[PDB]
Structure formats: C-alpha cells, structure tokens
Structure 1
Amino acid sequence: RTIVRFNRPFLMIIVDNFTWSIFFMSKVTNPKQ
C-alpha cells in the first residue's frame, strides 16, 4: 500500500555495488524535453 511517486525534483546516484564508486550523480528538477 506504499506509493513512491517521482513527480517532483529528485536525486539519482548511480553506483558500483562492489567498489562503492559513484559513477554519476544527478538532480532532476525538470525532466521535460
């Protein structure tokens, strides 16, 4: 019954699970093209 709705600004961090490297970090404040 829990809902998670990315309909407002959010962060996204892309990581390597073994080395804990942050490949990319992103803030999405406006996804529209």
Structure 2
Amino acid sequence: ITAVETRTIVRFNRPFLMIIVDHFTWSIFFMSKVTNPKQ
C-alpha cells in the first residue's frame, strides 16, 4: 500500500444524475436520477 496527496476525488456515493444528450439535435436519449442503486 501507498499514500498519495491528490487534488480531486469524485465520489458517487450519494444521489446523482446521468443525462445522455445527442450532439446535433440535443435530443435526450436517456436520463436518470439514481437515489438508491439497490432498489
């Protein structure tokens, strides 16, 4: 094991959004809010 000092951690351990956007049309193929990954 090793210890390192880092600038940025991104941790999806709380509710989050995902959005799938088409470049040309801005059509939203898909969108989700994950409030509970287990349900």
Normalising to structure 2: TM-score of the pair?
Answer: 0.66
Q: Which runs of 4+ in 1 moved over 4 A?
A: none
Largest Rg, 1 or 2: 2
> How much is the aligned-residue C-alpha RMSD, in angstroms?
1.3
Count of residues paired in the alignment = 33
Query: Higher relative contact order at CA 8 Å, sep ≥6: structure 1 or structure 2?
Result: 1
| Structure whose residues are more often strand by fraction | 1
Identity of aligned residues (%): 97
State the TM-score, normalizing by the size of structure 1. 0.71
